[PDB]
Amino acid sequence: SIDAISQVINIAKAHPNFPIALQWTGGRGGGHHSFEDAHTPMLQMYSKIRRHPNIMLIFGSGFGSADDTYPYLTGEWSTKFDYPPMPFDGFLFGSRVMIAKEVKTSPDAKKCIAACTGVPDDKWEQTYKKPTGGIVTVRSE
């Protein structure tokens, strides 16, 4: 969230020489996730993040191809949002590689993962109430 991004910025300020990789992931990301949107917190905190050159912005939480990450690489994803271009320094693909050949996931689990059709970003919030795209939210211990 914003407080976490502020803490990361404070750590980068305390150690300007040491490289810090801010791996931003919205609530739409797989596994454990927060309630924050993937886009708006970046729109708020990008200027502060880039105020420190030693922070690398890595964008995950809902990426599985080059087509949907290229706008984030070039930064033109923000042009539709009435913002200037916002290039990102990298990406992380968590759920996209869950059905890779070398992952220890079982064949039936891989078939189930592939069977999950997914859901666009604007409808990711509809997982705390009912399943959408084959994925639903649950609560941990």
Partner 1 sequence: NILEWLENPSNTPDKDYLLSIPISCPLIGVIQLAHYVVTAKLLGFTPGELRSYLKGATGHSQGLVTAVAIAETDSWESFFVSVRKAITVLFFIGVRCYEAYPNTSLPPSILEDSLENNEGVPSPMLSISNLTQEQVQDYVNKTNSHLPAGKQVEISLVNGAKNLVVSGPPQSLYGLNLTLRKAKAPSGLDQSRIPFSERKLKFSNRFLPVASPFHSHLLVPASDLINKDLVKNNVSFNAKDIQIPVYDTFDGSDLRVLSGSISERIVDCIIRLPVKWETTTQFKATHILDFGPGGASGLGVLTHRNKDGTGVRVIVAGTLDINPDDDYGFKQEIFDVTSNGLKKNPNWLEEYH
Ligand X SMILES: Cc1cc2nc3c(=O)[nH]c(=O)nc-3n(C[C@H](O)[C@H](O)[C@H](O)COP(=O)(O)O)c2cc1C
Note the residues at the interface with ligand X (CB under 6 A).
Answer: 25, 29-32, 60-63, 92-96, 98
For residues 66 to 105, the per-residue mask of contacts with partner 1, x marking binding by CB under 8 A and - elsewhere, is ---------x------xxxxxx-x----------------
54 binds partner 1 (CB under 8 A): no
Q: Is the separation of the CB atoms in 96 and 64 below 8 Å?
A: yes
CB of 82 to ligand X, least distance (A): 25
Q: What's the Cα-to-Cα distance from 76 to each of 44, 55, 71, 84, 99, rounded to whole Å?
A: 16, 20, 5, 8, 30
Q: Is the separation of the CB atoms in 55 and 20 below 8 Å?
A: yes
Main-chain phi, psi angles of 23, to 5 degrees: -95, 80
10 binds partner 1 (CB under 8 A): no
Size of the site for partner 1 (CB under 8 A): 21
| Residue 115 neighbours by CB distance under 10 Å | 8
Q: Tell me which residues touch partner 1 (CB under 8 A).
A: 1, 27, 34-37, 40, 46-47, 50-51, 75, 82-87, 89, 125, 128
